[PDB]
Design a binder for these strands. Structure first.
Lengths: 48, 49, 209
RNA sequence: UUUGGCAUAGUUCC
DNA sequence: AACAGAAACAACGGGCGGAACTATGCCGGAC
DNA sequence: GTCCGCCCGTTGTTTCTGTT
């Protein structure tokens, strides 16, 4: 996101990346929100 | 690999979707006594929680 | 029916007499104890198209410590008491120089009227009692132990004796049935006297908050 | 004299 | 007519025993 | 070395009357 905001984006890549970073941080805090992608890493096991 | 995995682990389904796969099929045979072996080979199961 | 309506009015009047006697106001024995036939004779045995019309039953009585401090017991004739009715009652209280008053309601009061009752609290004190809540005396029920309202002097002495801050007492809500029966505001402390199975008597204290 | 974890199944005792 | 206080119904979320002992499968895939 | 099964406390929505 730093690189995109430095080199200039297409006004929607920035928004999608912001949403993705928000999802990653939220799932790091709690990985049980209702109606979420439910991030996994490997073998299909959800994180902790 | 699919047949071997489903029989080896007991999670009846694909490996990627072992979340809703019903576990508890394909147990490892009991060999403590002959009666244990027979009563294991003739066994039922109700999927109720 | 007329008999049932007379009976309800008589029961409400008797409970209010008991309430005033408990609150320390001066109600005589004959007023406290009226038979149904005596009430029929004194104020009409026919309610419908009869002398008792939820009016002339209003009670004005003076406290035993001050004849200047008196209370009203008003009987609105309207199933839903309104802002104008509350204003009329407050006008009558202002003209008679009366601080406190009770209001027995047929069915209920609109929230606007209830808020217009709350607003004038330092100027006047008025309480709403439903018609169903007074057909019985909750104090007489055996599940309800005796309650005594404690003076500020008794409160201070108690707090000093046990070295308690008022946060450290058990509490009782200002909307409690018995609290409404005794007319207790926030910050007053009631005393509970009840028999005990292991001691023979036990006195508790509750803070209205 | 050095330290794996996740899941599933079965069993013992109230 | 506009505003406001109180209430009926609907949707959402967290909660669900205590210990202990064995065994077995698995921890990413293509180029 | 790179890419891909039941209970019941909150809060909302909607509705229904009262005041001026």
């Amino acid at each position: 996101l730093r690189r995109n905001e430095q080199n200039g984006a297409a006004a929607h890549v920035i928004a999608e990346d912001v949403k993705l970073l928000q999802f990653h941080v939220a799932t790091m805090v709690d990985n049980e929100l209702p109606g979420l992608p439910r991030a996994m890493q490997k073998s299909g096991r959800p994180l902790k | 690999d699919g047949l071997k995995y489903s029989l080896a682990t007991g999670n009846w389904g694909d490996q990627k979707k072992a979340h809703q796969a019903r576990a508890g099929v394909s147990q490892v045979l009991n060999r403590l006594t002959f009666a244990s072996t027979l009563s294991h080979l003739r066994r039922l199961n109700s999927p109720i929680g | 029916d007329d008999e049932e309506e007379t009976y309800r009015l008589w029961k409400i009047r008797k409970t209010i007499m008991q309430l005033c006697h408990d609150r320390g106001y001066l109600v005589t024995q004959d007023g406290l104890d009226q038979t149904l036939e005596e009430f029929k004779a004194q104020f009409g045995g026919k309610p419908s198209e009869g002398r008792p019309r939820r009016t002339d039953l209003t009670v004005l009585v003076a406290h035993n410590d001050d004849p200047t401090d008196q209370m009203f017991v008003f009987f609105p004739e309207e199933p839903k008491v309104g802002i104008k009715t509350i204003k009329v009652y407050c006008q009558r209280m202002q003209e008679e120089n009366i601080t406190r008053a009770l209001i027995v309601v047929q069915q209920g009061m609109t929230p606007s009227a209830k808020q217009s009752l709350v607003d004038m609290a330092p100027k006047y004190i008025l309480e709403q009692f439903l018609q169903q809540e007074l057909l019985i005396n909750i104090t007489e029920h055996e599940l309800v132990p005796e309650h005594v309202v404690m003076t500020k002097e008794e409160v201070t002495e108690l707090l000093a004796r046990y070295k308690l801050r008022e946060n450290q007492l058990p509490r009782i809500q200002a909307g409690d049935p018995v609290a409404r029966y005794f007319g207790i505001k926030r910050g007053q402390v009631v005393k509970i006297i009840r028999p005990s199975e292991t001691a023979g008597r036990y006195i508790t204290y509750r803070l209205v908050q």
